[PDB]
kynurenine aminotransferase; glutamine transaminase K (Aedes aegypti), 836 residues
Amino acid sequence: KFDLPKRYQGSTKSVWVEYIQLAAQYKPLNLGQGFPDYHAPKYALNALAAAANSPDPLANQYTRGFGHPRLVQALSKLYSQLVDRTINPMTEVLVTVGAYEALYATIQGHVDEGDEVIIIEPFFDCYEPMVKAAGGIPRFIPLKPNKTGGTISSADWVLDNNELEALFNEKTKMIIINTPHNPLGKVMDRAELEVVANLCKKWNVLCVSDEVYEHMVFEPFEHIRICTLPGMWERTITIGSAGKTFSLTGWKIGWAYGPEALLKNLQMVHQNCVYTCATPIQEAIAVGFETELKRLKSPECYFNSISGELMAKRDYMASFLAEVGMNPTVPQGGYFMVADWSSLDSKVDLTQETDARKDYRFTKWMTKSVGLQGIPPSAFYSEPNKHLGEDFVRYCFFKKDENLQKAAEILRKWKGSS
Amino acid sequence: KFDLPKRYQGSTKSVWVEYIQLAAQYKPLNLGQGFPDYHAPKYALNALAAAANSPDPLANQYTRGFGHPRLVQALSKLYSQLVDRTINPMTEVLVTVGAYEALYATIQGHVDEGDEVIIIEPFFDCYEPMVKAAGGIPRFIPLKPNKTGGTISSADWVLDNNELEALFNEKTKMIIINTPHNPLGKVMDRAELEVVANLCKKWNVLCVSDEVYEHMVFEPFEHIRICTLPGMWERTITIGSAGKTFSLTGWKIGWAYGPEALLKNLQMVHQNCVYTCATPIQEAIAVGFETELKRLKSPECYFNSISGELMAKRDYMASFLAEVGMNPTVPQGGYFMVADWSSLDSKVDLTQETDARKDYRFTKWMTKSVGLQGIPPSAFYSEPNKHLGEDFVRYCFFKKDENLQKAAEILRKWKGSS
Ligand SMILES: Cc1ncc(COP(=O)(O)O)c(CN)c1O
Ligand SMILES: Cc1ncc(COP(=O)(O)O)c(CN)c1O
Ligand SMILES: [Br-]
Ligand SMILES: [Br-]
Ligand SMILES: [Br-]
Ligand SMILES: [Br-]
Ligand SMILES: [Br-]
């Protein structure tokens, strides 16, 4: 065989392939997909069909490059109101293949051979490999919970401020923030936003805000975007996804917005990476935004209704998890839940990648033995910090009510309904 | 005023993210670009509507990273019969965001700092910035016509074999061939394939074969896959594109196929660049392939009929270009035609003190003055060899007959039929 692509990371340790194979083999109740197991808003789906059947022959041929005009116009209209700034749809917006390619273009376009990039743990999968492929030097800080009080919220997962400030120096090029957080569901409050913002200003660093779950914060809390804080617009790039916005994860269309000066770099990467994105999908998404745009302050707006929809599911999962004996972290946003398992550790029941990490062991055991699949949070930590995720497990509650209930009956039957 | 030494220098905007703005500004007869003017096969468009409207909720959520299982299976079935070998759909094929991202994954995945990459001029423009971004060192050889003086064939555009072998040394990592060739339309015969194949076998270099136009070769020529030469399968990566195979450039789905050992590198680049490609589009393309797989030898097969559809249009354009004074190169394949325009070629009636490669100026002045697009072939040459393309223009003849007559009319009037 060959070897290394050319001094790469070869992240074949992509948890997803491993767990997809496991689910295929054991067919469990799958709480590990990362997407809804039912249908997305009908208007969006019909929009794609209408684009496919469009009478315009150009509806399915190459579109602009930096973004389908109908789409970038709609995105500028939405985010212009959200950040109270007129965003230039042609120079301050870039459509990319999902938020994923947006991340890639921003790190590939702004991180060079020895640049430091601080990453908050647990991190979304691609953050470290992308940094490393850009030649950058990742610098990790974990979010860690406060275990006292009883109940636990994603708000209780916090950073050490002294550690955080010590991580920043003149070599810091970039910091990647994820709000709402995957998978904790943590929503950064203004104070937390201010801590990062002041650091970025003090050391002149680019702030990359992964805000894919921006519309899913649960009522008590509020999503606040760092690009709105004093002095941050000029040093922030924020990212979103149509997949997350409209629950159409297989559509793989996302975007970055920010000052043209910063977006320029993403453009040079994008243009010689994929050059342009699917035209019928971008048209369908544009009509989806136009639709919501007309009812943005209405409770039936999908941007407003998603949270109510998921909140019931979140409280249900939190409840049955606590039931079985786990301690769930209640998320402030998103559709993932992390819970601390204190069931039979690496005892008679565990014996797998024993060498490896216990959360892998547990999650594969429950799939095989109980028929319930979750994901191991250890996968989202740097090797030296992996032990912080070993007591936990990630579940997704964006699921049909009957499947959530099946999961509850399996845990009850496993536990012993009292 | 920082620097991005990742070699993402210059290239402020590719030719596409320039001329695509000129057309979408002066809205002329768009013969530049590279797409059909009219509807693509209905069975394909129908298949996309069907995927958006599928009762299966997974049809519009995340599919396998390396490619939708249905597409990969169909891709393997097709290419297995053409390459005369069973290709593994799971490890020897990778689905990508057009041939563009396939090319990107291949270069990023196989060329490290200092690797030499041989590119043949004129070349599809992304080859050079891709190898630059990977830290590679491009080496160029131009194709030149055989003492031509008017209407000739793309067959007489040839490279100097002694110049070619001279380029091969122990630093040579890869060579990129494009057949059918953009923008000449050149189809490499067996002898020309054997020449680069022997050099690849002697110098242990990777051959990358861009064959997105594989189904548009005109009689009496035929497309030959270099991966079928004696010992080439182990050292060749072959690329195709659904946008070109099914005339749906807007779908942006391509693929790479070859030995598992070479494909792993690609997988790793893709995984950490975009992770996955649109699911409903991949499904629609899979259904397209399954449709054609049943009538491979029928004249109704789009793989067979497209060249007969294009041939008449090719003949028409060669005639009206020659009637207006140009000396066109009749392509053996594809839907592009380059022609030598002679307004200043031997007449001092024109002179541009400006000094900026004439084909850019001639071609821009047409869309703005006569409402006829076209693109400057100097954009497909390395900086020192650009002058080679200055007396040429590339046109696309994949258009409705009525628009083709429109071009010939604005050309006759422009010159003066009388
Ligand atoms: C934090 C985060 N960032 C980025 C992405 C990527 O989004 P996309 O699927 O649009 O590429 C995800 C996807 N689930 C995500 O959770
Ligand atoms: C030679 C060549 N290679 C690759 C591509 C890109 O293909 P795709 O649009 O499928 O990314 C083109 C596109 N016009 C091309 O001409
Ligand atoms: Br609806
Ligand atoms: Br809520
Ligand atoms: Br909110
Ligand atoms: Br023909
Ligand atoms: Br071989």
User: Anything to note?
Assistant: The pocket of 4'-deoxy-4'-aminopyridoxal-5'-phosphate (ligand 2) is lined by residues B 34, 98-100, 124, 178, 182, 210, 212, 241, 243, 249, 252, 254 (CB under 6 Å).
